[PDB]
């Protein structure tokens with residue numbers, strides 16, 4: 001393996017068929033805000049991972065492009081197909097489409113831009129990760145479309161100026177950088193102050209497990225898309241982050257519609273924090289709490 | 305008056321003696337978080353205003369230093385006494401001490417650093433306001449103390465590089481910059497994206513024409529009939545959009561303490577901002593009118609463990 005790699009996880013199950021809104025999407029309250037958020041239409045998430053099955057039935061209509069920054073496929077930059085499975089799983093939790101079967105993501109009208117920066121074994125060079133971040137920031141679509149969210153479920157032990165500068169470049173250019181905060185060897189980039197660091201809980205809101213986190217989301221028994229047009233149930237710290245990345249698409253639409261202006265990445269971060277409900281551990285352990293997308297509606301007009 | 309000046313306000317009453325917790329301190333829920341935040345101990349707020357009555361009895365024990373950046377007192381930099389009143393009133397809302405009498409502020413163990421950047425008439429040169437911001441950022445106490453919060457209740461019509469650079473310098477050096485919204489003669493610095501812009505409601509959480517704003521605001525706090533400290537060891541009741549900002553400046557001292565304890569680590573200006581927004585309860589006005597809501601410091605405790 002190369003130095004930066006996927007935070008370890010467990011495969012619970014693989015199935016060729018599903019038809020449900022996964023419970024993770026349901027208990028972070030995504031369906032409650034879908035109408036007001038237009039399901040994340042108009043936002044694009046750069047998924048920095050192992051690639052994606054581009055013609056997966058739940059995902060094909062949501063992918064707007066991609067790039068391969070790894071040596072895989074002889075270094076062909078137009079081939080971001082998934083030779084691991086993990087990047088396909090991430091993509092589904094973010095933005096699997098409503099198709100009448102399979103699964104549905106947190107933001108089922110957001111667009112995905114697939115950045116394969118990990119090789120088939122789930123590892124990559126620090127420089128690949130730094131370049132993936134800068135690429136995401138700098139990319140422009142045909143009509144000047146850009147990404148405002150990037151998500152990673154990876155870490156490496158080394159603090160390098162190249163990688164930290166990339167993260168600074170992203171947030172200074174109003175891109176939210178989501179990384180899973182997991183188990184030292186996986187410290188960076190999640191440890192950087194600029195990053196929205198996500199921890200995991202199970203569906204009973206118990207912590208999965210010094211990490212400096214901002215928020216928790218579902219990470220146990222998470223069903224999503226996988227290779228060969230089928231599905232897999234994974235459990236790990238890194239299963240949480242993709243929920244937050246889809247949530248950000250919904251929240252930027254919610255907040256900018258409310259405020260009637262463009263909001264900075266600082267302000268978007270506050271709007272995410274706004275929508276976290278403490279479970280009742282300490283903030284050192286759960287950050288701001290559990291992602292609860294409809295919280296603002298519930299507190300409105302509620303006075304002492 | 306000069307170009308940059310205090311945002312207009314009314315003096316409703318002026319008394320010699322008072323004994324209460326002003327309602328604004330109450331309704332923002334500051335007492336509910338005092339224990340957890342050690343009443344703002346260890347935090348210093350830079351009050352950029354007309355000076356302060358440095359021996360006021362509600363204030364003298366809270367004040368740790370000052371500077372005068374104006375031409376008042378023939379430019380004596382060590383004379384930051386208040387020749388207007390408004391600075392004293394602000395200082396009181398932020399951090400008036402617990403005494404058995406008088407008033408008490410939102411953060412009654414927070415320290416004040418008094419920066420006189422406005423003249424007796426409540427106006428100042430943009431340059432003085434720029435310098436005041438940088439001054440607060442660069443200042444270090446006898447043991448290396450720093451300010452992490454500055455507050456202003458002023459505005460002027462002109463955007464300039466100098467003033468915006470000062471604001472950015474603060475925020476990039478983790479200093480929260482709080483600004484009252486103007487009631488656009490009073491557009492800057494409150495219109496800078498980097499600043500926390502605060503609007504006003506009254507004690508029924510209602511809007512009023514005199515306190516309304518067209519500024520892009522982040523939060524609202526009480527601004528109508530706010531009793532605080534004033535000249536000659538007395539008290540005054542002021543109404544005005546700018547009455548709200550000091551409630552937020554004090555609140556930040558409480559927030560920084562309680563959130564850095566909760567997280568068990570130092571938090572950036574960005575993170576402190578989120579900590580503030582997460583303690584705003586929407587009242588039902590538009591986001592233009594109220595930003596993220598009304599300052600309710602105990603909100604995080606109220607929502608804890610509450611899932612649908």
Ligand code: NA
Nearest residue numbers: 097099101103
């Ligand atoms: Na589907």
Ligand code: NA
Nearest residue numbers: 401403406407
């Ligand atoms: Na007192």
